[PDB]
Design a protein around this ligand. Sequence first.
Ligand code: ICS
Ligand code: CLF
Ligand code: CLF
Ligand SMILES: [Fe+3]
Ligand SMILES: [Fe+3]
Lengths: 477, 477, 522, 522
Amino acid sequence: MSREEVESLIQEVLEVYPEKARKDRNKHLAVNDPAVTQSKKCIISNKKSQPGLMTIRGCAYAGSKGVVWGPIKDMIHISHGPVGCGQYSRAGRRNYYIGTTGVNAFVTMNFTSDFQEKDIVFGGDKKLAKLIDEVETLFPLNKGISVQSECPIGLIGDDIESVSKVKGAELSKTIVPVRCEGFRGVSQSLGHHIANDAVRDWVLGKRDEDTTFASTPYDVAIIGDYNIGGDAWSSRILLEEMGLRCVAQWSGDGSISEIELTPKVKLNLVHCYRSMNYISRHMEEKYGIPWMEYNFFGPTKTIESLRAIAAKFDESIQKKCEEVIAKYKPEWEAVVAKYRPRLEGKRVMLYIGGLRPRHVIGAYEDLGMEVVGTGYEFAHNDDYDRTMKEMGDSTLLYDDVTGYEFEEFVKRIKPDLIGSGIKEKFIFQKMGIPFREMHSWDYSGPYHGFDGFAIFARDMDMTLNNPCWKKLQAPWE
Amino acid sequence: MSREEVESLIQEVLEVYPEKARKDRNKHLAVNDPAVTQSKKCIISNKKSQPGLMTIRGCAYAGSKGVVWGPIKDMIHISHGPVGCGQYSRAGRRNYYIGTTGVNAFVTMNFTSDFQEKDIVFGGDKKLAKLIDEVETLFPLNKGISVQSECPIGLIGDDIESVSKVKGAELSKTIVPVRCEGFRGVSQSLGHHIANDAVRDWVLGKRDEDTTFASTPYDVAIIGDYNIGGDAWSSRILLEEMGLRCVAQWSGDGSISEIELTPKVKLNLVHCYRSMNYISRHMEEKYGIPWMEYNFFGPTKTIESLRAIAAKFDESIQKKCEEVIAKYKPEWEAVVAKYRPRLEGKRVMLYIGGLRPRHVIGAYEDLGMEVVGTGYEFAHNDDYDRTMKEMGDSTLLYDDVTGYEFEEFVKRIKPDLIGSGIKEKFIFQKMGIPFREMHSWDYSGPYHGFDGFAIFARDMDMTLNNPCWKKLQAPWE
Amino acid sequence: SQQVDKIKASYPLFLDQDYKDMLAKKRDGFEEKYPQDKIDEVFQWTTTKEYQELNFQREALTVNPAKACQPLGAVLCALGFEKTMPYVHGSQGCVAYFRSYFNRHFREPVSCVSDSMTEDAAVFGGQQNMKDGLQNCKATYKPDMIAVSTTCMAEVIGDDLNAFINNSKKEGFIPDEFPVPFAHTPSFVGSHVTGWDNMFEGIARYFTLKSMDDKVVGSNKKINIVPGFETYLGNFRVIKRMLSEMGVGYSLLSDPEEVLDTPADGQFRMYAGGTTQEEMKDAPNALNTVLLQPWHLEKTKKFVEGTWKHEVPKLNIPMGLDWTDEFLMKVSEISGQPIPASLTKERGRLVDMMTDSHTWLHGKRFALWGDPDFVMGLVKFLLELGCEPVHILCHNGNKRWKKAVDAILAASPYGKNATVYIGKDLWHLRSLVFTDKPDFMIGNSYGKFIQRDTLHKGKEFEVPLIRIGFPIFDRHHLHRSTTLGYEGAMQILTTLVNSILERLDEETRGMQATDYNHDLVR
Amino acid sequence: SQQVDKIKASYPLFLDQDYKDMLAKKRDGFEEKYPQDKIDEVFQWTTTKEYQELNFQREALTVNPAKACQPLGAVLCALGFEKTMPYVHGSQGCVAYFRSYFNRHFREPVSCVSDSMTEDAAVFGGQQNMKDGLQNCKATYKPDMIAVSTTCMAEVIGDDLNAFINNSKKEGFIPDEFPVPFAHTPSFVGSHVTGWDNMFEGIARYFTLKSMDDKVVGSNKKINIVPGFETYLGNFRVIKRMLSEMGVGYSLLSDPEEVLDTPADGQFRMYAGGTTQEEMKDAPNALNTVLLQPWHLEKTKKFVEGTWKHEVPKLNIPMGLDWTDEFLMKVSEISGQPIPASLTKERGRLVDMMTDSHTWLHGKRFALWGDPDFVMGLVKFLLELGCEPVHILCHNGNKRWKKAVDAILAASPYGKNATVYIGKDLWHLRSLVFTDKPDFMIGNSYGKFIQRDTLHKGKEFEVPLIRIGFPIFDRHHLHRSTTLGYEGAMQILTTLVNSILERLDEETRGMQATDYNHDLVR
Ligand code: ICS
Ligand code: CLF
Ligand code: CLF
Ligand SMILES: [Fe+3]
Ligand SMILES: [Fe+3]
């Protein structure tokens, strides 16, 4: 398809809308041009959703509890409000961890204040205070409590900050208030922000006066890898084989102690810029700790990123970097030799949240596949900036894509593979298009590092070339 | 019903037969009398089955392979002939054992010469001989081999005896030929006899000239407990707490060595007269070893048999007998206190093989129940002798009962419970009559000794009083 | 490391020596973890009678709920009408979760829209969201009807749905006669089954309240069937099948079976099947209305009795043997059609199965949970089988329901060891299966984590999960099953006996130790 | 000892310390058992490649067969006809075993008689038994037809079935007109499936050979369906249901589904349902005859083509997707009825489940066995699912069959690690699952012993059994399942994917070891 056919497709799709939504949606749909290297010049992002168009977006609570806070394994997180939010988000996200659940770790459990009508009327602050005490009795090895606000908390005028301060002092315990009510902002994105501000104000400082931690020149932190299917452990093994010491890793398989030790490190390695740039900037200004983005998705990006990381230290680390590279070279070369022939020339459309739509492009390229359309749920313009340069000319870009748009684009572009979320999966499968989940990894993974690339290639292959796709037409039709 | 009502029942049932089958079956059905004992005063047995009437009876291979030889655990038993016999009898009978199956024990395996048409034409002897070498190679820890003849072996003139001697000497191994072809005799019974003679002729005498076995005044053998559901182990424990040493126990959980040590004991305790009396009389004749029958079915019988066994020895065994009786007293009285109220008054009809139809009466009586009919597949007149004094006046007796007869008797007598075999079970369940399998114990047991009585009672209760029985009639009928 | 020819996913990959050592250093260096001895000691304590007492003293904290919120059920109710778009007035985050909660249970697309209320609507109300939302929805996905429910944001701010929808029509955003039934569905009242009831009652009102004058009870010669919140496709099917076998004219009100089970044949179908608007308008002309799950269909019953004048019969959910009998006999009496030979035979086939499996079922002890109607049906069937339901937990149950279950229990000797718990959660149930250990759990996927904890204490303490309920996320296609009727009873019996036999096989598989009882025939 | 309130059966009773010690003393005292070190060492050896070579060298010894003998199949075939008593001329022992074997699988009565031939008849022939037997059977159990097969004794001595039956009629033991079809069913040729074939052909010949002159192909507008040896009730039901949905007239020749699934309603029915004699007489008037399991219906085929002149079409067993499609398409061509909307949809539902479950099914390795038509259909479906059938075993299969299966394997990349074995037994299969380990076995209850052996080597070596086939004795009511058609493919898929996920659950249940991958959602 040519530029003119895409642009034509865009206006064709907008026809169905009433004028108000039409005009807004036009601004969120663009064709990429390598001639303009500046996000705004092409597309608009991080605006309100148009009502009733079937956006794929979640809320600020999903961004704060589901994404940033929930993975922290040795704290108890309370879904404070009515029963729904905590239930639907119980163990739906694969932020993997090591611990003894119900005893020292609490990730896949659902703790809630389960609001009734009386708590709407009189407020829930007295119930929150009692809940905190019941939690200390029943879960004595918890090392901290967060309070994740659902929609009604802010709307009835509760003061969870006051309950948290008074109860924190009484019990000599960290209780973190989080105002991540789902009506706040436009998407999961503001939830990230509020949750980073909460880490900052209530946890990250706890050890500013302590000098006992013995440091080394090679201390780093892995910030914003949520360890989907083990993703962070496959990234971590490579940093440790390269001679760095990973003092902290959060929030996937993250402990509160390692959040509190993060200000001790020499470099913050940031996997997800969108969710964690707020805290990373705060740490540079307050502690003089630099940060850098990196990508361990596919061998090309992994290799480039190891080199860039190594480059921030001395010769000895750069040496180990080249040894790690030589070690895994045969393994990834074999994955390529086996799977690239089976995937070469096939065309992929992506739709994910705030990072993966650009971050996974390199891995597809290492298998000789072409990303012909990508898009984000809740990215900002600095994200679209990095995207336009990683995507080919005349590719489609879509922001806060509606159900209708995504289905009509696909019908016309006819990609060979789609990578999106659970809400999209069963749609395109029915239309005969191979589909892979690019949040949950379809219950597979890891996809990070050299070990994850293997898994990643097997998965794309098993699905794209599955014999089920030849069977959708009954032979008598 | 009075005697007369049963008498006329037998006549009504017989009217359907043609004359020849009518006259025969009259002789196999009778009513029990208050004075007249000696069987041949009132019923005939151990005759041919009338063709086409659906006898429940099996064959001489069943009696020999499935019953006597099959349970012997450290030997390999060959179903010699075509494929069916060994397949249908593979692990149908729960003769429990301790061992490592396929390595040093082989009970639930099916070894066969799987006759093809070439073996009918040329005979099976060369195949048999090759088959034995293959067994020695593949199962080197077998301690002997038996050859269980199926129907065609005798009919085509094979000489298994000669193969067995020649290969026996060539390989220094015990190889037992058994002529238990299914066309011999009229039932499982002849299979018992043939199997006992083969034991006599080929195994029992192996240690006649050996004197190394260190004997005691208290050595016994348990003969003809096949350990169904562990029956034999529940009897054994009682004999040993009484201070006896059970040197041999066969066939259930029986090893070939224990068979060979049986001539060294002081007393043969025979569970099943019908199947093992032949070898029992031969051992008294040849070695001077006495035998007695015993019954550990229900507390009444168990107590009386423990006393009778103890009486054959000195005062120290008699004292231990009383300690065993006193120890188990509270246990079995608690089974009675609990289940007798739930079973008191209920009426039972039985049909089984050669022993249990009379042997289980006492246990039912211990639970307040009444046996209003019993009969045997393949009993002899001495079995019926012992049976008439155990059954009430005016009860029904049936030998080689036909499918028609059993159904019709039951319709008219309306017992509360039937205890029979798998071929009978689902017929009576459909007629809304609670049914317990009294060969297999319905996958339960043991039913022997005091521990067995607990299970037997639970089992009659769970089935007799089950809520399902009230539900057969749809409420709109 | 990977061997390219035998690639390892997370399991068993992180069991490789190099990962295990790396994981150990993470923990020892920087996680400041409680010692293993203390972890073990606290675990043991959480299994005790002492801890169960503290646990059942909770008033403020809920741990691991066995319920969801109203609007989830409203959506599922709305999914059951012809070409209908469920539409939740409020915040969009709720909608993403509703859809993905159902996607994972049915392995199917789920269509639902929000009108994306934000902080601005928090101040000024959601009026504009409704107007633009309805117009955008109608034009974009071309539904024949939009069924409006609410999230808790919109309940708290007090948005007037009726006015908001009327204004939307008055100002020309959707056509005047375009159907927009609505219901208030507050997440802080009752539960998801309550949302199902509120939505249904709002839809029945929309199509019938103002056209009542020409209606005559019985003039269409049909019986209305309201299924309630239902996530087994077989339960819809079996009810239709049985009524078709009796030759009973009927009308299933809210029927999502088609839209939740479309073919993968090359096209995506947003809408399929479902109760037509004509069937909802004509529903008052039926002989009567039968509620399949009455303990969550109370508001619907008040409406049907008060406005339609149907004498809704006192029938329990048709689960197990006696209550499928009663259901068929009531339908026979209402319709004047006899129960036919086919269903009499199907019944006796169920009883045959009960006769064949009663020895293994007898005295087997169960903990179980779910919605009120489903739980009482399961309890009832367990008693009919000779099983003992020892822990019966219904988080969204009420005191009147519990009294009805206690009466059911008292009428059978098999109920003597049973206790009913309402308002309790799966952390309460965890204690129960440690201190008064049953043989199995019957429940949804959340129970796999209770089975894990039991096994951590030791193999002898493990209580296996049998998956019956909603949601089931960790097996595939069980949502096709049936729990109602004779068919459903047959499927449950089979599943229960084979779970017991499977477990006995596991316990008897040790060679020369336990395999004396490893029987070929059971 | 027993505690009266908590009674123990054999498991776990004999684990009590006093029983253990007793068992120890028995062993050490008098069993003269090989030491435990030697047992371990021989076990290890039986799992090796060395032992496997020896095992596959056997010529004379068969161990743990996966087949039975002809007359078993003759009996099942006969039970499929209206008020028909099966009758096996020869020894009664055979008959006690046929009935038990089937009782235990179907958990139902199974009616069959012998004429009880003994040593007398070995020498003078069974003529007298046959005369008395036919007269006694007719009078006592009042069948409308008696169908005669033979045990190996009657074959070896050359009893003339034909003459014996004629004389019984001549000499007035049963009426001339009374139906008594017969077949020679020697146990020393083929297997149970061969007996089904022989018996069916004998029944078809009886009713049609002498009356061909008034017959016109097509005149009755039906298709004959011959199921072959079939022990899932769901497979008779699905075939009927699909043809009824198509509006195709058909005649199921041998239909035992009613007599093997009677109601438990207070009476025993010896006979129920079954193909009528009028249907067998009229069968030559059909358009054609379809054989559902052609690889054991060769003799039946030749009769049908040679005498009835139907052009029996070349169709595989309708299992899995392509072959169910091909079956339906062929039936449409012959009948002139279009494939209807309902079945098109059902197909697409199957395809949807395939798309939903492909990720867990992909690459999974299976050892399997059974009868030849069932085995090849399971093989086909497995390839369609993206599974790898590595050990394919058919003890009663032949060279020609093997070649066709090899060709099915070569048409798919998923076939490349597959080997087909014929004439081999479950002891051969045991070696295979040690030396080239699959993930699962698909087979009958005899496989449980192979699973046991594998676990004994170690947990990592265990190969779990998935029970599909015959006989199944150690689970309840699985005989009601379906394996043909789309319905059957739906059941097999669900079972296969859930067995995979259940195993993954078991491997990931260890807390703080493997539970990182114990996902709620799969
Ligand atoms: S051996 Fe006999 S038929 Fe005495 S052939 Fe039979 S395990 Fe029966 S009544 Mo099955 S003479 Fe044993 C018997 Fe009794 S197989 Fe068992 S139950 S006590
Ligand atoms: S945007 Fe708000 S914080 Fe986000 S997910 Fe929605 S409530 Fe929660 Fe919860 S209980 Fe249910 S799902 Fe809601 S309607 Fe109230
Ligand atoms: S009385 Fe004879 S020894 Fe007894 S069980 Fe019958 S054959 Fe066997 Fe075997 S193979 Fe089959 S089952 Fe037979 S017809 Fe031949
Ligand atoms: Fe689906
Ligand atoms: Fe049955």
